Design a protein around this ligand. Structure first.
Ligand code: NA
Lengths: 101, 101
């Protein structure tokens, strides 16, 4: 559904970063931001949205230790198996901000 | 390339969201989060990092109007052309916080 600009203002892009000042559900405001590097993609010169399947096919997410993600996900033979990934692998700290590279 | 957890503490995974409080470059701290649904994916049951080429093949990004990304991207034949996309198609404000949905 999207529609952020409807309830936001003073938006800006910088590199692939988007930042805006957005209304709460109460009456105040907050300034967040999203990296668009992992959400849009370039196909022959045109931008498109990227598909994803983590929220929709995996479950019961958890952090083990300092940088290990753990969950259970759905296979091709449509059964849930246990899987794990080191988030240190590609998640970095870039001046107090968490960044995917 | 990566290894955030050597300057971050108190990390937490909730849903697809990772949250951590990190070491600013000077001496201080900042608490961030990154939505992993667009960073990792599941391939037959196993979680894999997702590749993407936007900032790697595109340049000169601009917010045009209220909600439109504009940029120039390289076509398979290595030529920069024009390309826009409406961010409001999937960027949302969830309680003062921008989300991709
Ligand atoms: Na992605």
């Amino acid at each position: 559904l999207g529609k952020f600009s409807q309830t936001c203002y003073n938006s800006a892009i910088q590199g692939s970063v988007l930042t805006s000042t957005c209304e709460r559900t109460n009456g105040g405001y907050n300034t967040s931001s999203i990296d668009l590097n992992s959400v849009i993609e370039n196909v022959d010169g045109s931008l498109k949205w990227q598909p994803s399947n983590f929220i929709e096919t995996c479950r019961n997410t958890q952090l083990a230790g300092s940088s290990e993600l753990a969950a259970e996900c759905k296979t091709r033979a449509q059964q849930f198996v246990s899987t794990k990934i080191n988030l240190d692998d590609h998640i970095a700290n870039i001046d107090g901000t968490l960044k995917y590279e």
